[PDB]
Design a protein around this ligand. Sequence first.
Ligand code: GTS
Ligand code: GTS
Lengths: 208, 209
Amino acid sequence: MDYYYSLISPPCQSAILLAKKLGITLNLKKTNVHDPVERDALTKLNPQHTIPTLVDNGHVVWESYAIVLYLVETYAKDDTLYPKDPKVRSVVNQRLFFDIGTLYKRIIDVIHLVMKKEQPSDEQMEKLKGALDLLEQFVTERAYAAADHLTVADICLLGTVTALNWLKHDLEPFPHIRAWLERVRAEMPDYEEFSKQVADDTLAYVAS
Amino acid sequence: MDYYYSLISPPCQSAILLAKKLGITLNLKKTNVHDPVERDALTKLNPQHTIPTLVDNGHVVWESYAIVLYLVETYAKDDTLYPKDPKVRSVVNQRLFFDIGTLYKRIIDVIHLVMKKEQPSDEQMEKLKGALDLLEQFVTERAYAAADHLTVADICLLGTVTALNWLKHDLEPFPHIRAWLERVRAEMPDYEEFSKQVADDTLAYVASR
Ligand SMILES: N[C@@H](CCC(=O)N[C@@H](CS(=O)(=O)O)C(=O)NCC(=O)O)C(=O)O
Ligand SMILES: N[C@@H](CCC(=O)N[C@@H](CS(=O)(=O)O)C(=O)NCC(=O)O)C(=O)O
């Protein structure tokens, strides 16, 4: 399967971590969404021309969350990562839509600005800090994001939280989130290597 | 099951419509998420205190999308609204994330500004357009949002698009969306009545002002 991405792209990280977890092998293809030549070809596959974008057996999937769920259904030998019990799955789903519509949303906004080098209103931080508060609670009731064990909600939420690195966000006030991060990364195969590049690549994007 | 909501809220209309399509009884609970007393109450069940918020036999669920997918899986006698084939389900899922994070995000952003008597930048109106052109394409490659038949994608996107009504946003340039609109509503049980129920409530709400 083909996978158009950029390691510096938080959403692009989800499937990468998932693939290693499931032992799935992807055919990485570094994509520059600002290259008029690369956008076209990408657009021919995904009209919204955004990364990540998966192409498997000719079937196209975009939106990290849709990529991740497709992979689990299609390649996971079990349902542990995306439980079938509707009472558990609804928690995973809620967290996934929480990730894209609340948590990462507010994080991405401050980052975007921070790059533009402009002060985020003394109220955008509120929604930010408020987003984290919610997550702090989620990982207080249980040891994982949406269940008593690791799910694809943990993988997505991990990318969004570790993205708080761009901005300098002290995690001290969020012990559970800290405990949760360590526990989830402790289950991600090849994580350390992954963490280095991602960590180093960002500072290289900051170099500018 | 209890359903904290308000027909004025576009996200809340998804579970209402879906409910009608599948014969599910919803114990409606009009909620003013702005009222502190109601706000605190909701919180106890949903720490985020946002509507829609469902409560099936003690099992709490929020995010119109999570509620939707939950009801279908739990009560749908069929899987047509949410196909099991990963090849199909990926499109539905993608279109759903397109809704919450692309189309509705750019719509509600504009509405929130107009509410604060502010104006959208040219960029914002451009992404608005951009999201629509995409939806326009989606409903051209197929008669429906994510497949050759109605799915939960159509229901959620239908809520999102009719929300454009608050901005008197012209859909004239979007032919397939207009067509697609008629198709979906013609398939929602007693739509005109729902739409009129929305109208009544919105008037009864603005009356609270
Ligand atoms: N919700 C999408 C967000 C992806 C996204 O915003 N991708 C950006 C790049 S990045 O910010 O994640 O690095 C993109 O493709 N931008 C190009 C474009 O929008 O045309 C997902 O989760 O897949
Ligand atoms: N993503 C959520 C969005 C729901 C939402 O934002 N609800 C608002 C009200 S409305 O804009 O839809 O009318 C709310 O409850 N807000 C209360 C709060 O944010 O505390 C969903 O789809 O359920």
